Design an enzyme around this catalytic site. Structure first.
Site, PDB file in Angstrom:
ATOM      1  N   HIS A  13       0.790  -1.216   0.000  1.00 58.81           N
ATOM      2  CA  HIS A  13       0.000   0.000   0.000  1.00 58.81           C
ATOM      3  C   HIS A  13       0.827   1.272   0.000  1.00 58.81           C
ATOM      4  O   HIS A  13       0.274   2.347  -0.267  1.00 58.81           O
ATOM      5  CB  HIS A  13      -0.925   0.001   1.209  1.00 58.81           C
ATOM      6  CG  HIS A  13      -1.940  -1.100   1.184  1.00 58.81           C
ATOM      7  ND1 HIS A  13      -3.216  -0.912   0.718  1.00 58.81           N
ATOM      8  CD2 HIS A  13      -1.855  -2.406   1.545  1.00 58.81           C
ATOM      9  CE1 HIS A  13      -3.889  -2.045   0.821  1.00 58.81           C
ATOM     10  NE2 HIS A  13      -3.083  -2.968   1.319  1.00 58.81           N
ATOM     11  N   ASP A  67       3.685   9.486  -1.037  1.00 58.41           N
ATOM     12  CA  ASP A  67       2.503   8.741  -0.624  1.00 58.41           C
ATOM     13  C   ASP A  67       2.254   7.635  -1.639  1.00 58.41           C
ATOM     14  O   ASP A  67       2.357   7.859  -2.847  1.00 58.41           O
ATOM     15  CB  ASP A  67       1.266   9.661  -0.503  1.00 58.41           C
ATOM     16  CG  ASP A  67       0.159   9.094   0.431  1.00 58.41           C
ATOM     17  OD1 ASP A  67      -0.219   7.897   0.288  1.00 58.41           O
ATOM     18  OD2 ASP A  67      -0.350   9.853   1.304  1.00 58.41           O
TER      19      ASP A  67
END
Lengths: 447, 450
Positions: free
Chosen positions: A149, A353
């Site tokens: 992720h 991110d």
């Protein structure tokens, strides 16, 4: 056919993104969700198991020693900083590495009794990189998939990890490796190619050390209908008409947890640049930053933000106008969506991110006939599909300020075109499409 | 009869307190105001003298080393922390003391040609403790008075100063020593009698080492009708607009220089105590703290600024709402006439230093109120003003819950009691104004026999 999902934590029975995709997947073919239950100091009780129809929840506990070496130290003080390009925050010590392996091996042994020869196995984040390897050592030949992720760092960062070669060898014991973005996938293939000779056909079929595996990109999404539904309801009464207290004010909004990767000090500096170079907004805008605290690794970030709120308000504030509202408070998720909807500018500018879901939540929350503007970092994984956002380099505070000013003065025509095109991206690739693509690719692997 | 005033800085060409007192005193029989111009370099150039009728303003410059040893080090990093009961901030080094003594002798030498036999000489703050002694060494027999604007510390604090005994000896070369409070005056007599046999008659006539001197209390005041004139004027355009926005909010207000003696972090914590223990005020009050930029860029005072910025951020982060910011901290300069208006429209004035000679913000606040509908003054008992402003809400700033309880009391006080408390303070301030202050001191200075 039956699906076994292993993640660092399971959900008791929506209220989030990844929970919806995992539960959507477990209902499609039935199966088991296996994960840490949240509590500590009593490990040897049997497996907590709750069953509901199609699915079984199976959970365990962890001793305090394992949690700190595996999760507080190696996972969150070695892998997490390195994968977000911060070697200067890496605190590697070999006991933490050994504890990381020990916990991974210990949960492989808890899971082994529950498996069947036919199950497909889906392992989630960076806490469980070695999990496949531990299952292969127990003779597990199933189709196993991994999804990361967070970003996967480029070789010159990754190979500085003292155990990088072991991590890489264990990743190749998965049959399918999923990534948020294509740069993450290629980053892993570069690190692997620096360590061992790799064969690639088509683009995503590979062999290394004689092990066959695939890689693929599956950007994680949200469920847009539910966000729009929570966003369009009416407010708490006391908050019903602070929308009505501030009719004459444009709101820049952001909500992020406190973390070095999110670059929250740099957003404040970008907002200070907006105040310094576009004085026409004085008294007519507001920046609101909601930053809940949930670990002493993160309070020095909190300390710096409190200082910068005070300094910026001290310098640009007026007796009747404060530029920056900083809130270190928890707000319930259904209220955040309404705040998204009523905010003129959503500011999502992390320094690194894997995928920022706030960016997609902000777009899914807007009134389509009068939507706000998304200002997005080019280092957010979401920037690869949300191309009609205002993309910025957060290392250039004036460029972010220029995008904020452009966002604040943008016509409704251009706001609708940009929002409609981002919304189409998010609706077409929602959380449910994400889990289907992954399960469909995982099944078609040959053991 | 002619008056010579020596202070560290002078006002060359009234928007102030002590400037108004010194100038009233000078205009009574004419005279000379002698002080540093504020500038470094070209120290050997002649005295810049400006004359307007009866009065002469004469200034000098100092070398950059003189400014640093005399003023930055000994005056502001030894005497100031010690006189404000902060021995932990004293940075004594003997070069600073020698430069303190050298600059005092050097300004005594510059002043000597300007003196006349009959002049009365008035020396002001802690920068010039040795000045009387330097003039006596040059044979100056005139009447010389001293006024200390800051507190005088108790012996267990003062005696930690490595040169405390020399300072006391030189103070006794003044004929008259004035102080803000009776506690300061008595502290000085305690320091003196701990070192030497002191004789006292009536209450305020003394001898030490064979030297005769008087002591007395002269609390410094303000000019109340000038404060009231500025306070009642109409607002600047952009600040006129927002008295119309501050309709449903009660403002607690404070304006202070950044300095360890002011306890600004403790005021913030008192405000946090109010927000934590009187949730009924949430969304309906505001604390505004103005903390001006400092000319001198004093590194010691920027740690204070960093600390306030942090606490402003933290307190707003914890109690703020999406539509309400509790604490407005402004590190900006506001013009003095605008502050007086802000005072008048503020429901509560919060003046809670940890140690203060006299806080004149306290008196300006009450002089600024509309008497028919005044705000409430919350005042530290360690402010020199607490000795005459007895109807303020007196608080101990080391008890943040007691300060919060006074603020809650101030915010809910009926109009009758606000008028009663304000009227009694205003009478005190009108009766002992800045002009009464300088007249009492010069009249006492004049009746001294050389």
């Amino acid at each position: 056919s039956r699906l076994v999902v292993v993640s660092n934590r399971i959900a008791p029975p929506s209220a989030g993104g990844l929970a919806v995709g995992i539960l959507g997947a477990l209902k499609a073919a039935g199966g088991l969700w296996f994960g840490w239950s949240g509590e500590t100091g009593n490990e040897d009780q049997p497996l907590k198991k709750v069953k509901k129809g199609n699915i079984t929840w199976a959970s365990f506990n962890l001793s305090e020693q394992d949690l700190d070496e595996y999760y507080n130290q190696f996972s969150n003080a070695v892998l997490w900083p390195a994968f977000h390009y911060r070697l200067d925050l890496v605190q590697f010590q070999r006991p933490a590495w050994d504890g990381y392996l020990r916990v991974n091996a210990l949960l492989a042994d808890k899971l082994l009794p529950l498996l069947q020869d036919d199950d497909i196995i889906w392992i989630h984040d960076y806490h469980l990189l070695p999990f496949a390897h531990e299952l292969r050592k127990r003779g597990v030949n199933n189709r196993i998939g991994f999804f990361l992720h967070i970003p996967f760092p480029t070789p010159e960062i990754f190979n500085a990890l003292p155990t990088y070669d072991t991590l890489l060898e264990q990743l190749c014991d998965y049959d399918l490796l999923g990534f948020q973005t294509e740069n993450d996938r290629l980053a892993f293939l570069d690190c692997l190619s620096n360590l061992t000779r790799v064969t690639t056909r088509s683009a995503k079929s590979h062999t290394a050390w004689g092990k066959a595996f695939r890689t693929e990109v599956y950007p994680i999404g949200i469920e847009p209908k539910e966000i729009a539904k929570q966003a369009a309801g009416p407010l708490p009464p006391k908050l019903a008409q602070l929308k009505a207290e501030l009719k004459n004010v444009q709101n820049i909004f952001s909500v992020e947890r406190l973390d070095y990767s999110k670059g929250l000090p740099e957003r404040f500096l970008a907002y200070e640049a907006l105040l310094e170079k576009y004085p026409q907004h004085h008294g007519k805008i507001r920046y609101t930053q909601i930053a809940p605290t949930s670990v002493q690794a993160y309070q020095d970030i909190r300390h710096q933000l409190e200082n910068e709120a005070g300094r910026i308000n001290g310098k640009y504030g007026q007796l009747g106008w404060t530029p920056l509202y900083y809130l270190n408070q928890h707000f319930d998720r259904k209220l955040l969506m309404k705040i998204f909807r009523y905010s003129d500018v959503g500011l999502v500018t992390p320094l690194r991110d894997g995928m920022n879901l706030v960016a997609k939540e902000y777009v899914a929350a807007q009134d389509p006939a009068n939507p706000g503007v998304l200002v997005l970092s080019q280092f957010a994984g979401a920037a690869n599909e949300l191309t009609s956002a205002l993309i910025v380099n957060p290392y250039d505070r004036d460029e972010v300020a220029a995008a904020l000013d452009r966002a604040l003065t943008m016509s409704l025509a251009e706001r609708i075109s940009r929002h409609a095109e981002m919304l189409d991206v998010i609706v077409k690739n929602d959380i449910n499409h994400w889990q289907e693509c992954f399960i469909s690719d995982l099944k078609q692997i040959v053991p």
